[model samples]
Target: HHWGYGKHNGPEHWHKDFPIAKGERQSPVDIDTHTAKYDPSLKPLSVSYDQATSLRILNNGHAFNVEFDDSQDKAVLKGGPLDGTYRLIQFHFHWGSLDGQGSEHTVDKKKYAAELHLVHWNTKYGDFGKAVQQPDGLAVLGIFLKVGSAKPGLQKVVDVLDSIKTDGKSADFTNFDPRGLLPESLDYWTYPGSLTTPPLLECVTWIVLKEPISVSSEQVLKFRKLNFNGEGEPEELMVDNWRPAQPLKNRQIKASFK
Candidate 1:
């Protein structure tokens, strides 16, 4: 009965909280590339990461999250639509139900099988908590995933899902690097928007890459092993954790390249 993706607790009822569920600059808009203006002023998206500091994985009763070391600037993102330095705090994933469309934001309304959100917060405001409150305090690097050849890098991640199969479970996940998971091209579509998850704050600057990475359908099935229900509740499989795309509103989506 908590705020979840079920028929009753899902997004349709979120407006009862902030009511901004229908407010300005909402997220996960269907991006129509043909209409996107190619902004020559947009800078190349820049990113850097360090594997030495620390790493871990957890199930937050929603999605599978891989938290990076947020104590320092070991991993960071800048340039593009972000003016100040932003640190990669953590990344989480989303997907659709069995054999259904899973990706949150679709290009021209074409759905993919899965998605990943690399969440970064601008230190210009403060840490993630404080930063998330400002309009321009966050940048989420969204990447879509489709069924294809098995991903070697992704294998390591799925292998550990069993360790944190239930809600709020966690385990140390090191010797891993998400930089390897990025698609070949850094070109993307950008827009002013909010987080897809509930408590949908209108603070995120969405930078969705154009090219999607490949993942085998079989591996995606492994994520189903994760239960959405907590340790005590009856087992409820984690499926279709993705949020629906909100309206574009009075915002323009810009493309990094022509």
Candidate 2:
């Protein structure tokens, strides 16, 4: 077996938020200095999105954010800037600068309470299972969240959260595009590692952007009010719906084109 997620209860409690996330390689693993390795030579093979990206809005009572599908508009991650054709799969966030300083990659034992990740697959290379094996095969975009300026690049996304404030509920918002939430600087820190959750696929080439995107304090508070379960008492609410840090093993995180 290729050291994927631990069996039994290892992923049981962890997969609560994202049921599909369980048994996946990469994720919920402590990213330590030992396992994080770097490569400055790596560059984004390509980044493109369909003008009309369809979003299957889910109120899930947790929050709202645009999720991109690979087949739609055939949103492909083609050549050059990116060496493969990666279909844009999904995107999510992390928050802090308050609570635990929302960030996935911890520096000096400090962990961020929230962090956002946009997962993609390189079709030019292989499937997520196969790509995880090669350093240049997978690409995940990470953006940090900070409290300041009240500049909610993603406010439009949170606007719909109130509509789905209840669990197991979702909305359909068409003609949606995902470029708005992206930070001004595309420059990112690149490294290799497993998924941040269970199954812990080691096929990911993480591209953590250095510049953090901003979200309003109120907006974050609304997000915090989200519940993980579809229906339950107030206690069942997932106040912090975030995964804790995982073991880095012997990985080294590196900054890109710096």
Candidate 3:
């Protein structure tokens, strides 16, 4: 049984194939401001990104990934709720078929048009794939997308969409700084959770931003133009590829700011 994230093959059916879909620490949980505990000890995040490390952009059937060169600490995340440095690996997005709501994680039952995930792996674990198997393996910084002014950083990314319209297609994407995609506020909510997609390993330390970045309605619609099918296959619009919020269970979300 294949997982498509919507229709009959959606999240509710994912457990048939990937058992972890029903795991207690599953991701994309609703972030309730009133429920999150404010920890004064949470440190401000320190992010360093090297524009040259941006290698290429690929349209994987699920989403568009802008990969980086994580060979060294050229681009790293430090001083947050993490124990060690986490190297930047890649970044992708999840959006809806239309506008209004598509983000995986919501704030107080409110959803945004889309969301961005900047995936990183702890250096202590050596590599990304290996790190994913550890408890403190990965850290994902999630940023919500709202309809407003056109974002200059996102415009650079959207400009390249036409080149990688079909699944499995890729193109050179150099000198793009991912930091430009984040909001002004570094404040975030942290929790322990798993990947929102299949193989749903419970290894990610989720840090969702309190503020959302702006993107024009025109730019937001560009994502829907992508096809889930590969070249020469019947075109299927790639939209709503996000998993619904899972049960919070016994987890407590920690906030970096009061």
Candidate 4:
């Protein structure tokens, strides 16, 4: 059976096909601020994004992701628990059907309206394919999205939702800078985690920002307009596209704040 967020094949049944789904270092762990040790040694996060690096946006049946040109170091992320620079590959979001819940990772068990994931890879091990298998291969930035004001950076991407509304649909999307989507404060909680989706690879260094970027309630509704099904496949609306919190086990969540 194909994997999806439906009742039949959702996360609860994922362990059958993808054994790593129940692995030790799974992602979307709950960040209990009290226990998240404040590490003075952690450096501030550095993000450099260039509009020229933006390529296209696509609905990959899972979520809509904005691609980037990573051949060159036009957009990169470093510092904050990472030893080397990681090239920006793509960015996507996880939201809920309703406003009450959606974010993958929680803060003291508080869930945000949505979550943003910016994926990057350490180039020392070559491209993403080879890099993803290494322990220190990926550094993914996580930001929470709350329902409040209209986020200028978020509106830019939402404007194109009509063009690629169905799964597998894609369109040329350029001149979009993801750096503006971040919150003002870079304070975050860092830890060793895995991808929240299939394969559940344990290679990510998660840096979840403390503050959340605000977006209008209507704007969030626009996200639900996109379809999970293909062009003519009975149109299943894409919603609640997030994996729940996993067991923290032996992981230690380190914070970048006092």
Cα RMSD of all models vs. native, in order, equals: 1.3, 5.8, 1.2, 1.0
Worst 10 residues of 2 by lDDT: 1-10
Any runs in candidate 3 off by more than 4 Å, and if so which? 50-52
Clashes of 3: 0
lDDT, candidate 2, 164-245, per-residue tens = 6666677776666667657777665555565665444566767666677766678677676655455555534345444556
Question: What is candidate 3's local distance difference test score?
Answer: 0.91
**Using TM-score as the measure, which candidate wins?**
4
Stretches off by above 4 angstroms in model 4 are none
Question: Considering lDDT, which of the candidate structures 1 and 4 is the better prediction for this target?
Answer: 4
Please report how far candidate 1 places residue 62 from its true position, in Å.
Answer: 0.9
Give me candidate 4's TM-score against the actual structure. 0.98
Better of 2 and 4 by lDDT: 4
Give the alpha carbon lDDT tens digit for every residue of 1-258 in model 4: 289899999988888999999999999988999998989999999888754379999999889999999898889898889999899999999999998798999999999999999999998987999988988889999999999899987888999999999888999988887877988899999999998998889999999999999999989999998988889789799999999999999989999998
Sorted by TM-score (best first), the order is 4, 3, 1, 2
Q: Which RMSD does model 2 reach against the true structure?
A: 5.8
lDDT tens digits, residues 63-103, model 3? 99999998988888888899999999999999998777789
- What's the residue-level lDDT of 256 in candidate 2? 45
lDDT of 1 by residue, 87-144 (tens): 8888988887765588899898998888889999998776888988899989999999
Q: Backbone collision count in every prediction?
A: 1, 51, 0, 0
Ten contiguous residues minimizing lDDT sum, candidate 1: 46-55
